[PDB]
Amino acid sequence: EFPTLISLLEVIEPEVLASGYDSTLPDTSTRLMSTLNRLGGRQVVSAVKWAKALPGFRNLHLDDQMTLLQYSWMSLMAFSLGWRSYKQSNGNMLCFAPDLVINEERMQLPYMYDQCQQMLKISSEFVRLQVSYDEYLCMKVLLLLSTVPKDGLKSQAVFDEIRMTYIKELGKAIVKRSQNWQRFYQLTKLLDSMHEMVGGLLQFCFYTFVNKSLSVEFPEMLAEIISNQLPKFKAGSVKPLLFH
């Protein structure tokens, strides 16, 4: 019989991309942020493929699929970054890629320290709660489904049912490992706090995107997403789904 949803989430999880960061040239903040955005664009492409393979996702209207990915790309990438940093270094360093870790000479670069602290926060929550792989996979799906327009979606019905599916799945992963309800509480608190941790990252992203002087480069993928997303965030027409 048919493979479990959880086993499917494992097979569709993208492989970690390499950055090609040349730690041979001198470390500058503009160059590091540019490299991170390049790697970001590629990871997002990877996430579109992943979302497409996601049972249920293709049943949403194309506008809604686009909306969800637009609003949650930053949280998807920050969540995986937290995961890799947890597995690869127990949350001691940011592990962006096998060829790109943030050491103390590049954490001390202008603008870096604060953004890196916010990202390590995410990592250290995985450490605190000792999150399992399966918990992580289900939570990552829920993140894709966590930020919606205040004016609702088109296929609201299909959307509500998709959320129910993956909440079930998180529940099952919790069952198959404190106490079930406490664990669910803690993990959905973690999801809720992602909105705050990531709001700050978005703010800095918008700043590096709009700042002419700074000359941080964005690939065209992200540039188009960010460019579109920015007016919606100013206008405050973006709603977090919170469990609490």
Binding site: V48, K49, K52, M66, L69, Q70, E224, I225, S227, N228
Partner: peptide
């Protein structure tokens, strides 16, 4: 609307 994103979703 973000063209590369939309295209990515419409295709492969």
């Amino acid at each position: 609307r973000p063209a590369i994103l939309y295209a990515l979703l419409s295709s492969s």
